[PDB]
Ligand SMILES: CCCCC[C@H](CN(O)CO)C(=O)NCNC(=O)c1cc2cccc(OC)c2o1
């Protein structure tokens with residue numbers, strides 16, 4: 006679910022950043038590691054902000070809302086992190102938003118790959134399962150990626166941990182594909198981000 010909007014692609018793949026107050030040393034170390042993980046597998050690079058107009062700010066905030074997707078432009082933008090959502094893999098996902106990705110399950114073609122089980126969604130959290138409009142996404146010829154760091158888990162916003170809100174439709178390698186990994190950028194994520202940023 007890469008943005009279709011070229012103004013949201015950070016020019017030259019260089020993203021200035023600031024780390025705000027109220028984090029521990031350890032949380033700040035994880036931020037740098039997550040930024041470096043992006044740097045290792047793509048041409049995207051994070052740079053400590055000096056005088057740039059547009060830049061990201063790591064802000065202490067309760068988990069959930071919101072990390073701006075892609076470059077806002079004309080000023081600072083938030084990448085929001087809190088106590089329960091600050092592990093390496095979560096921050097990598099959040100930087101996925103920064104660089105221009107929405108959630109994989111909101112791809113316009115998602116109904117060919119997953120079922121949404123509405124009845125299992127926590128009340129008032131249904132908006133998290135809305136498809137993006139076709140005009141807002143350009144997937145760049147890349148197939149729907151179950152292993153994506155941007156893909157929800159089977160029971161994300163579920164009323165109970167044993168109930169699925171998202172179910173993949175078909176078996177891949179003879180078994181239903183696992184979703185919701187927060188370990189690393191997937192092969193699919195790397196391929197897609199390289200196209201988005203026109204990496205060499
Ligand atoms: C109101 C939308 C709730 C979004 C919450 C999620 C949390 N994560 O999954 C983080 O990984 C989120 O941040 N998704 C990505 N960002 C957005 O969807 C989003 C929309 C939006 C609209 C106006 C202003 C914003 O400022 C940060 C926005 O973020």
Ligand SMILES: [Zn+2]
Pocket residue numbers: 098099102108
């Ligand atoms: Zn997200």
Ligand SMILES: [Zn+2]
Pocket residue numbers: 006007109147148149150153193194197
């Ligand atoms: Zn994808």
